[PDB]
């Protein structure tokens, strides 16, 4: 055989990156966007809001976060 | 445009084009090295970085070298490539674009790096020196661009015009078969080329003997001997190259190169000795030419020569099929002499 030109096309781009950075990029950008959302799942932890909204449905790490007062020993 | 191309059961193929273009030819000096610099440069069609491009994901490797008489136009590919690295060295032969933006920019940078570098070396100096002393300006132009003579870009066009015609080269090739390689330089810009004259004049170039050159220089200094051949007493200086930068002789361990240059028209032997010291160079050169002018039996290197211009006429496309039997001795007469280095304390043409 004999191959008489180059029979290859342009790539999908915007100059700095392109299609192929972030599909090799992609993986490991969720699992950057998980151990962000997990950063500040660590980092907010004494916010009472995320405290009893979700950081007590967690299943056996649940009882550790609240402690039992009786309501008639605290000043407010 | 002759086509002269082999076959063999190979994958990897060559096709080269050589032009009658070194400063052999040149009307400035350092023109040829100028053209040979600016060779795989922009095309009117594509540039020089999408030919490059596009010929390494086809698998190739351009080159352009430049000797005295020659510049080659070379590309290496695999095999199945033939067509588009023919139609590539027909672009690039057609229609460079001459530019001075890159003239300024890839030209000269290239050039003054090659000059540096072939300066910095003391034996090419003494072996074009050899070559300007004993071809006065024949063959005898230097090979290297440096300033001297300013060289315009017109210059280069006018030049490039000259030379780059279709009688003047010549495409030979490794494993290409010859019909598809004659079917593919025509059907091309190769065969719609200036039909211009051909460069090449084959009477012998008119040389002068008894001459001497001294050339100061810092570093190791060398001393060179040429003697100027013909194209009938080839053989016998072929045998005498191989016979002195070999172990059949006492006279190896002072030469340090010892070569002869071959051409159409007749040839250069040349000799160099080089040493760090210099009253080395002097006794060295002095045993060595007062032991040539003796006489020497050259048949015992006659199978060794068969050998060696074997194997160096393997990959040329120039073969010159030299006899060999004819030769029985040698006994040195004239020769042109140049000193470079330490120039106070090497020996004169009269000392010798």
Same mark, same amino acid.
């Given at each position: 055989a004999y191959t008489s030109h180059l029979s290859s096309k342009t790539g999908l781009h915007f100059g700095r990156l392109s299609l192929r950075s972030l599909t090799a990029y992609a993986p490991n950008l969720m699992l950057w966007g998980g151990a962000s959302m997990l950063g500040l799942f660590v980092f907010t932890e004494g916010w009472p809001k995320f405290q009893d909204?979700?950081?007590?449905?967690?299943? %056996? %790490?649940?009882?550790?976060?609240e402690d039992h007062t009786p309501p008639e020993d605290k000043p407010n | 445009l002759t086509v002269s191309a082999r076959d063999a059961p190979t994958k990897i193929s060559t096709l080269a084009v050589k032009v009658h273009?070194? /400063?052999?030819? !040149? @009307?400035?000096?350092?023109v040829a090295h100028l053209l040979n610099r600016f060779n795989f440069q922009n095309t009117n069609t594509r540039s020089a970085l999408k030919l490059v491009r596009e010929s390494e994901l086809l698998g190739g490797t351009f080159k352009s070298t430049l000797d005295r008489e020659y510049i080659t136009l070379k590309a290496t590919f695999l095999k199945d490539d033939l067509p588009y690295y023919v139609n590539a060295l027909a672009d690039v032969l057609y229609k @460079? !674009?001459?530019k001075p933006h890159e003239l300024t920019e890839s030209v000269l940078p290239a050039a003054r790096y090659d000059y540096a570098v072939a300066e910095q070396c003391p034996v090419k100096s003494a072996e074009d020196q050899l070559y300007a002393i004993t071809f006065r300006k024949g063959l005898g132009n230097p090979l290297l661009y440096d300033g001297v003579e300013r060289v315009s870009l017109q210059d280069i066009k006018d030049f490039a015009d000259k030379v780059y015609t279709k009688e003047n080269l010549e495409v030979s090739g490794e494993n290409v078969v010859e019909a598809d390689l004659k079917r593919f330089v025509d059907e091309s810009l190769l065969s719609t080329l200036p039909a211009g004259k051909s460069l090449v004049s084959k009477s012998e170039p008119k040389f002068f003997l008894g001459e001497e050159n001294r050339v100061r220089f810092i570093g190791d200094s060398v001393a060179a001997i040429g003697i100027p051949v013909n194209k009938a007493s080839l053989a016998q200086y072929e045998v005498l190259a191989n016979y002195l930068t070999?172990? +059949? /002789?006492? +006279?190896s361990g002072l030469i340090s190169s010892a070569k002869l240059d071959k051409f159409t028209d007749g040839g250069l032997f040349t000799l160099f000795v080089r040493d760090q010291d210099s009253a080395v160079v002097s006794s060295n050169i002095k045993k060595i030419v007062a032991d040539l002018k003796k006489g020497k039996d050259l048949s015992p290197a006659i199978n060794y020569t068969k050998l060696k211009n074997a194997v160096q006429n393997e990959s040329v496309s120039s073969p010159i099929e030299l006899n060999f039997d004819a030769v029985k001795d040698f006994k040195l007469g004239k020769f042109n002499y140049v000193a470079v280095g330490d120039v106070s304390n090497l020996p004169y043409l009269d000392e010798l």
């Open positions: 909204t979700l950081y007590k449905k967690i299943p %056996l %790490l649940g009882p550790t976060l | 273009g070194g /400063s052999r030819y !040149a @009307t400035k000096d350092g @460079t !674009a001459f070999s172990a +059949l /002789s006492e +006279l």
